[PDB]
Amino acid sequence: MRLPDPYTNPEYPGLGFESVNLVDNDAQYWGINISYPELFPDEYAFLDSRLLEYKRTGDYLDVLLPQYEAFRVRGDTKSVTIPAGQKGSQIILNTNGTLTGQPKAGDLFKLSTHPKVYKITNFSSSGNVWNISLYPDLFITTTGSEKPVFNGILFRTKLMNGDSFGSTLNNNGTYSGISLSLRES
Ligand SMILES: [Cl-]
Ligand code: NA
């Protein structure tokens, strides 16, 4: 299930995060700490209903972190190839001349076929050959059918603080201190 935000639900601008911390837990997994601004009753009720549905159905929570949305690499990834049999800390790909721009160390990365999110540690190229160094090491050996993902990356997580989720209506008619602690699953 997608954690609702102002992109899925622009009617609730309060679902836009105030602060986000991406924590490295070293298999390696990312921890995500999200802090909300004060939420209006409709926003809080909608978020609460969506987290109750997540609790009811033992699903994951997919989350977009807009602070990593730099759109540094653009274009159609259809003819972009990732050769099979790769594992370790590097992903080599052939852009086929279809991608504009280049990624930077600190950017996120994901393979289209697997949920793991990586951090880019280094980038080098030789024409259409891109060499992207990743942290942590690849969770799978490539099959050759994967596509690189630079934008719109969703982290697949589980909620860690469901037992301390919630708030009470304050004197301003809003809900303060709402925060989500997520663990990449
Ligand atoms: Cl592997
Ligand atoms: Na949100």
UniProtKB/Swiss-Prot annotation:
The keyword Nucleotide-binding does not apply. GO terms for cellular component: virus tail; virus tail, baseplate. It is found in: Virion. It comes from the Viruses. Keywords: Late protein, Viral tail protein, Virion. InterPro entries: DTP-pb9_A-dom_C, DTP-pb9_A-dom_N, DTP-pb9_B-dom. This is Distal tail protein pb9. The gene is D16.
